Design a protein around this ligand. Structure first.
Ligand code: 0KJ
Lengths: 99, 99
């Protein structure tokens, strides 16, 4: 599909058996999800943006389906206000910017 | 151009007569540049990101040339971690997400 940017580019994703709305975010290196109790091992991480840093839990090799396009990779879970699909998964679904 | 996302989508912009590097950021409503001087009146504003809220200066109707494409719109100036081109100007240059 083509998604214009008049509004926030929110799409449906599925992770850990939950459907969620997430921002397709070219400015995000990593994927950051709102607090959710995922099973598995994780590693602590700090990530920075506007306002400073938040603490997140890094989970690896997590399957994520984004608008019916399958992906699998690292997901960071923490107190973000919005679910953010970052470049680590955007590349996997063949997402590009075009103008 | 078509820009893939295995690297950060950084591009050269021209603003207030100066060249800068900025990140094409579909996850940002608004364009936010690191501290700099711009001519004209600005209004104090606050914006929030993943780490909390910051104070910015809002400049309206500012010409910005982005990777050769002209935009004229709102530019926020303040302590962002990197220069970001948000949807307000990405729409002006006809930028879309595609997959
Ligand atoms: C440094 C560039 C940029 C500021 C990084 N951020 C991505 C932005 O697209 C970020 C995404 C976001 C959206 C809503 C609420 C919080 C955050 N946007 C952002 O800060 O915009 C400022 C405000 C908030 C939303 C908006 O439209 N304007 S991020 O902080 O969310 C982020 C995401 C993934 C990530 N991975 C490693 S560091 C890292 C940082």
């Amino acid at each position: 599909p083509q998604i214009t940017l008049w509004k926030r580019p929110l799409v449906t994703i599925r992770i850990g058996g939950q459907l969620k709305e997430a921002l397709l975010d070219t400015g995000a290196d990593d994927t950051v999800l709102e607090e959710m109790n995922l099973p598995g091992k994780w590693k602590p991480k700090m990530i920075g943006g506007i306002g400073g840093f938040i603490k997140v839990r890094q989970y690896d090799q997590i399957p994520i389906e984004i608008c019916g396009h399958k992906a699998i990779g690292t997901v960071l879970v923490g107190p973000t206000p919005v679910n953010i699909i970052g470049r680590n998964l955007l590349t996997q679904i063949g997402c590009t910017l075009n103008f």
